Amino acid sequence: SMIKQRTLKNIIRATGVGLHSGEKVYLTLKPAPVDTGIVFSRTDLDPVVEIPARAENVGETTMSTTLVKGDVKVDTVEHLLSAMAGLGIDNAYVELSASEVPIMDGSAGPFVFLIQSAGLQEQEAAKKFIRIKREVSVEEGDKRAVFVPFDGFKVSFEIDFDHPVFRGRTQQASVDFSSTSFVKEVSRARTFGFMRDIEYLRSQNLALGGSVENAIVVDENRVLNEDGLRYEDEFVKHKILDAIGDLYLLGNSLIGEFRGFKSGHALNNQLLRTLIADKDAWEVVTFEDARTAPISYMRP
């Protein structure tokens, strides 16, 4: 049997606060038809504004990944998108009551839980994958983001903070999803910030919802969160989580390998844009027989 498209089985609702806006927001996930993709909609507005979660709709990428359509935005999509990608959700409406996805606990754990509580529905259409055929790379200064051909899905990341909390950590991790669970090993990795960068945002009337309840706060010498880390390598795992989410703006699951080096949302989106434009570097494929596939998905 083919690998089929997936949507949600039921509607589910969550509440939280926008990391940047500090505004309380209601999120509603709904099933969608085949070939819809993930579509955001601002149900607080009249008319209601829909923004497909695609690379073409990305605006600002300086702090988080924002979607735009004229003067309407949806901020901070990446951790929700990471959860959709990690569970292989093809088709969904994401309704928001305000301009930002709720931060929840700073990770993708609450979203992965919410989605699986709703349950998944296989649909009668072949799931489309984007397969990397040729290496594609973007760089700026010492930052690099790369796609390499690979029969599977694997994401590697390296960070380099010249900082007391990070010295003598390897600062590198690789996850290969043939053997390793997005839920168990990536989903819980919380966002993080250094104190001087946080203070800068607050001075600009940003990061207004942020706190030790939804982020790892690192002062000049120490993590401030009294209860410690979820993973020895939570920082680099969060970078992988963000990459997975940013990558999902392609609109289809990837067959290939991503490697990031001190990269973030801006270079992640540049990599997508360069990939898309280089049509020799990728193809859309389906699997009529799941046994020939380099990726598999958990039961719905």
Ligand X SMILES: CC(C)(N)[C@H](N[C@@H]1CCc2cc(C#Cc3ccc(Cn4ccnc4CO)cc3)ccc21)C(=O)NO
Q: Which of 156, 187, 191, 269 binds Zn ion (CB under 5 A)?
A: 191
Span 111-130, contacts to ligand X by CB under 6 A: none
Q: Is 163 a catalytic residue?
A: no
Q: Which of 90, 95, 234, 242 binds Zn ion (CB under 5 A)?
A: 242
Q: Which is nearer to Cl ion, 86 or 264 (CB)?
A: 264
Residue 122, amino acid = E
Told to check if 213 binds ligand X by CB under 6 A, we report: no
Told to check if 96 binds Cl ion by CB under 5 A, we report: no
Minimum CB separation from ligand X for residue 91, in Å? 24
Per the CB < 8 A criterion, the answer to whether 244 and 155 are in contact is: yes
Stretch that binds ligand X, among 5-13, 87-95, 118-126, 195-203 (CB under 6 A): 195-203
For residue 147, the number of C-alpha atoms closer than 13 Å in the C-beta half-sphere is 30
Q: Which does 192 bind (CB under 5 to 8 A by kind): Zn ion, Cl ion, ligand X, none?
A: ligand X
Q: What is the DSSP letter of 164?
A: T
Non-local (6+) Cβ contacts of 153 within 8 A are 176, 177, 178, 253, 254, 255, 256, 257, 294, 295
Minimum CB separation from ligand X for residue 60, in Å? 12
CA-CA-CA-CA torsion for 126, 177, 187, 196, nearest 10 degrees? -120
Told to check if 202 binds Zn ion by CB under 5 A, we report: yes
Contacts 24+ apart (CB under 8 A), 66-72: 67/40, 72/42, 72/45, 72/99
Rounded Cα distance, 1 and 95, in Å: 32
Q: Are strands 153-158 and 172-176 parallel, antiparallel or unpaired?
A: antiparallel
**Contact pattern for ligand X over residues 156 through 185, marking x by CB under 6 A:** ------------------------------
Q: Which residues pair with 286 in a beta bridge?
A: none
20 annotated binding-site participant: no
Span 209-238, contacts to Zn ion by CB under 5 A: none
Q: Which is nearer to Cl ion, 10 or 62 (CB)?
A: 62
Catalytic option among 4, 154, 259, 265: 265
Positions touching Zn ion (CB under 5 A) are 191, 202, 242
Q: Could you give the residue numbers annotated as active site?
A: 265
